[PDB]
């Protein structure tokens, strides 16, 4: 076959960057077969898909005795660029390196006879979180959502702080977030996370990119990356945790609801009376409204339009931790 | 120590002979080819000995330090000097204070002691 060719180049490409990343010391990657991925995805044409994006598709699956979560790619996109294929290789290598931290979604191997790789991860029956919530057949209590918030905060601080090179996963969205049986969130899809050089949290980037609303307008009108260019987007994520609403929204209104603008104008004028989650009005919220408005104040504070107005992401996680540690 | 050049060339030649001798010796464990290999390498060893030896028949055949130095070229050692002086001011707190200046060659050990 030509599939042997798919071996003998792709992994070799693969090899010369994880040696460039970890100097070869990594996690026990499993090498699977073609037919097991065609079997567990049921020839990749069913309703076992989790979610989609531009360059990849998240599916469920089941190889023997363990259901898995399988990521695959799109052939025409990555064969139609010749220069942004290094993002796929950065994705597989960084998703290998982050796999030991708990609030990331672990990697359980790689089969790569396919278009370029096809990746496999452990199973999480709570699916990927939607633009407002769970895509289970139906709805989460407030403590569970605040736990999700603090652990996504932990994982992004792990991205920024745990290494001599700061990797800023700028496109944090609830769509990248999975959940366990015990509702422990796990980030994934680091494909656009660029790796700065060391000692320099401020180096001019190459092009502005990524996800309207979560774009961080500061980087959109300055075009150089700092870590705050993630933190802004994080707060909007927390608002989806808070509201139960989509980020970009309309209610018969011109496809125009900047939900950040809505919550700040309901702060300065409406006085925090509509951030009280109509998905979860039936909750107790006796003293929990106190931590709710603390969360809304913090989520506005990290979404502030200037850098110095925004806390460092470590501090964001720390005051999140004190917020849930009040109870 | 204190060796002439003929000894140096002979040592450099005998090392090559040692390597090829224990190279071909491992093939012990027809005998004809191995016996002629043994012949050639034995005769080369004996020939080299015989023609080196009359040159040795023909002819027959220190480092110190002190507390005197210059203290003008001594580029700043005031931190190390300070630390070692506060080590020496604590001499009575032991019975016999012993100290070590450990490093590679030509690093500053004698000069930091002189300082």
């Amino acid at each position: 076959d030509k599939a042997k060719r798919w071996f003998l180049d792709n992994g070799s490409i693969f090899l010369r960057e994880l040696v460039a990343d970890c100097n070869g010391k990594s996690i026990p990657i499993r090498s699977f077969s073609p037919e097991q991925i065609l079997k567990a995805t049921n020839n990749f044409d069913s309703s076992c898909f989790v979610s989609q994006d531009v360059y990849y598709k998240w599916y469920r699956g089941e190889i023997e005795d363990r259901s898995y979560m399988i990521k695959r790619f799109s052939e025409d996109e990555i064969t139609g660029k010749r220069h942004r294929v290094k993002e796929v290789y950065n994705d597989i290598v960084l998703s290998a390196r982050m796999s030991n931290h708990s609030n990331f979604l672990q990697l359980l191997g790689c089969c790569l006879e396919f278009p370029f790789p096809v990746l496999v991860f452990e199973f999480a029956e709570h699916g990927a979180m939607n633009q407002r919530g769970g895509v289970i057949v139906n709805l989460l209590p407030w403590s569970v959502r605040l736990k999700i918030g603090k652990e996504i905060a932990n994982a992004v601080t792990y991205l920024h702080t745990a290494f001599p090179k700061i990797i800023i996963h700028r496109d944090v969205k609830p769509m990248h977030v999975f959940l366990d049986k015990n509702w422990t969130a796990k980030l994934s899809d680091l494909s656009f996370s660029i790796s700065l050089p060391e000692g320099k949290s401020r180096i001019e980037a190459e092009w502005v990119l990524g996800t309207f609303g979560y774009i961080d307008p500061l980087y959109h009108k300055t075009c150089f990356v700092t870590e705050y260019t993630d933190v802004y987007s994080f707060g909007i994520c927390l608002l989806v945790i808070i509201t139960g609403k989509p980020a970009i929204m309309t209610i018969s209104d011109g496809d125009l609801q900047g939900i950040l603008s809505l919550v700040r104008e309901l702060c300065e004028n409406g006085k925090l009376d509509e951030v009280i989650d109509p998905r979860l009005m039936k909750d107790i919220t006796s003293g929990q409204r106190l931590q709710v408005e603390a969360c809304v104040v913090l989520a506005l504070r990290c979404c502030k339009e200037r850098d110095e107005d925004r806390p460092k992401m470590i501090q964001v996680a720390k005051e999140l931790k004190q917020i849930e540690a009040s109870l | 120590k204190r060796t002439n050049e003929t000894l140096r060339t002979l040592v450099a030649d005998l090392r090559e002979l040692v390597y090829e001798a224990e190279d071909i010796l491992v093939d012990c464990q027809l005998q004809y080819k191995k016996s002629k290999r043994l012949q050639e390498i034995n005769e080369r060893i004996t020939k080299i000995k015989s023609q080196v030896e009359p040159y040795f028949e023909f002819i027959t055949p220190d480092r110190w330090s002190s507390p005197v130095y210059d203290h003008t070229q001594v580029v700043g050692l005031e931190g190390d000097k300070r630390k070692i002086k506060e080590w020496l001011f604590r001499s009575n707190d032991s019975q016999l204070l012993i100290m070590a200046f450990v490093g590679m060659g030509g690093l500053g050990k004698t000069t930091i002691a002189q300082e």
């Binding site: 070869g24 932990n154 792990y158 | 012993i98 450990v102 690093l107």
Partner: protein, 546 residues
């Protein structure tokens, strides 16, 4: 320093010079005509570049200033010296200043096996960071290390390595928490010295033909580095991150020697699978070690291994596709090291692993399932090993009455358990049946899907543990025997807790359970916050108590 027994904190180690101080010294030596001031400003970049080539030794700086003080300050020979630096400093103006003599008198007072060990380090690039383990397997490979009194391979070569670091000929890059060394580098004047001593007897030519053993730096796919017939060893020296790309025909030349005791292929990509690349490794006979670590096209290592009766070290680590290990390794009974760490796809062994007895290191064991591979029962055979690495995946990997398979291992010093791809809850119950030997110097539970302690980690079950690290996992609390403070205590001297989200223990309770501590390195444990680390959350401290 220890033979006089100075103290641990009465030693003093002077550091290499800062570039500003080194420039001051070089002006004070060379430009001594007026004050140590540079009397013309066009020689300054040349002088600063030569000074950066000196790299902080005062002695090389004073030697270079000595040979420039006999010079008329013309730009051209200053440029000349700025490109031909070590050649003039091994001419030493016909041996007057002699950097090389003062370093070589620290060379030549070595035992001759340490001479042969230190000479192989002349086969590396400029300032690459060299792994310790590869040097040790190289030294055991040519037989630069001998042994009789039990201390067979790894401790003997490690004693050789520590003997070289004690002579200040080798600088240690970074330790671990347990004090052990992983990576190594040498100063560049010492590198030139050991090259020039290799530029004698035909150890390393490194150009041309006559070479006893060669090393391959990066990308000889288009250079055609030349291999003659002698070649006692071939190692691959890569400067920490790039991959030495190798052509297929050169790998065909590697099977064409007859006297090749060391062959390791480490940062490499080949044009073909390594099965048919190395079909004729039967033609290699006296081969001691193979480190086929981190090479892409290796699905299956070649079948013709049965004509390898010596084979003291077999390393294939970190190659994520090593499916079927071959039963022909059960034949020859004379290896020392079998090292499969993090080899993901691997069906868990041939049968007679407990047959061959002389081996000391067994990493990434993967005990078999029910009617498969090999179990833990014959590991009880191996009364000479001292480093063992497990990697458990599910419950029927192990079996209950093989729980006595680790009690009688007398000489054992270390256990690493890697429960990464862990599924079964019964495994958590089946791991608790295992007991380590009561002598055990250091263990590492690095994934461990349990919630409480493993219910043997007590000072009762293992009194002499000194080092202990717990990496990632889903652990919650430690059980009651883990404290055990009626009369027993741990005497664990160093401790590491890497990424444990749910771990709950208390600081002064640890101190009243662990009286003899030096350092505790925790860095991702957001539950704790009671420690003396600057944050047990998002970064790490060490807590050196004094």
């Amino acid at each position: 320093a220890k033979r006089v027994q100075a103290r641990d904190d009465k030693t003093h180690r002077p550091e290499l010079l800062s570039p500003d101080n080194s420039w001051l010294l070089f002006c004070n030596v060379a430009f001594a005509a007026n004050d140590g001031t540079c009397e013309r400003p066009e020689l300054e970049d040349v002088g600063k570049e030569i000074v950066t080539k000196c790299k902080g030794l005062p002695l090389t700086i004073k030697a270079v200033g000595g040979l420039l003080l006999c010079k008329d300050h013309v730009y051209h020979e200053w440029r000349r010296i700025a490109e031909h630096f070590q050649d003039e400093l091994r001419g030493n103006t016909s041996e007057t200043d002699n950097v090389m003599s003062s370093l070589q008198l620290s060379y030549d007072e070595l035992p001759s096996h340490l001479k042969s060990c230190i000479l192989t380090l002349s086969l590396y690039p400029e300032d690459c960071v060299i792994p310790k383990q590869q040097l040790v397997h190289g030294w055991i490979g040519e037989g630069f290390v001998m042994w009789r009194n039990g201390r067979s391979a790894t401790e003997s070569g490690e004693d050789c390595f520590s003997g070289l670091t004690n002579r200040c000929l080798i600088e240690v890059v970074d330790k671990t928490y347990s004090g052990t060394i992983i990576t190594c580098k040498i100063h560049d004047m010492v590198r030139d010295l050991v090259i020039d001593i290799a530029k004698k007897d035909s150890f390393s030519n490194p150009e041309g033909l006559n070479c006893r053993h060669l090393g391959i730096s990066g990308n000889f796919d288009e250079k055609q580095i030349k291999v003659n017939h002698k070649l006692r060893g071939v190692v691959s020296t890569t400067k920490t991150g790039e991959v030495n790309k190798l052509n297929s025909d050169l790998a065909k030349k590697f099977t064409d020697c007859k006297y090749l005791r060391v062959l390791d292929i480490s940062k490499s990509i080949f044009d073909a699978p390594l099965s048919e690349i190395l079909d004729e490794i039967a033609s290699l006979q006296h081969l001691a070690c193979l480190s086929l670590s981190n090479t892409h096209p290796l699905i299956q290592f070649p079948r013709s291994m049965e004509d390898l009766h010596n084979l003291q070290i077999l390393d294939a680590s970190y190659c994520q596709n090593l499916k079927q290990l071959q039963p022909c390794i059960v034949l020859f009974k004379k290896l020392l090291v079998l090292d499969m760490t993090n080899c993901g796809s691997l069906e868990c062994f041939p049968k007679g692993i407990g047959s061959l007895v002389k081996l000391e290191v067994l990493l990434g064991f993967k005990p078999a399932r029910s009617n498969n591979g090999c179990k833990l029962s014959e590991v009880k055979n191996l009364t000479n090993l001292r480093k063992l690495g497990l990697s458990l995946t599910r419950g029927d990997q192990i079996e209950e009455e093989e729980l006595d398979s680790l009690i009688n291992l007398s000489k054992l010093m270390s256990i690493s358990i890697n429960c990464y791809d862990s599924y079964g809850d019964d495994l958590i119950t089946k791991i608790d049946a295992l007991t380590p030997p009561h002598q055990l110097h250091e263990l590492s539970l690095q994934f461990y899907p349990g919630k409480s302690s493993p219910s043997w980690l007590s000072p009762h079950k293992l009194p002499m543990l000194r080092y202990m690290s717990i990496c990632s996992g889903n652990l919650v609390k430690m059980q009651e025997p883990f404290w055990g403070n009626e009369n027993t205590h741990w005497r664990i001297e160093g401790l590491m807790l890497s990424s444990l989200s749910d771990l709950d223990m208390d600081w002064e309770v640890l101190q009243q359970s662990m009286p003899y501590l030096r350092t505790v390195t925790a860095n991702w444990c957001p539950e704790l916050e009671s420690f003396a680390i600057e944050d047990v959350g998002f970064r790490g401290g060490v807590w050196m108590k004094t």
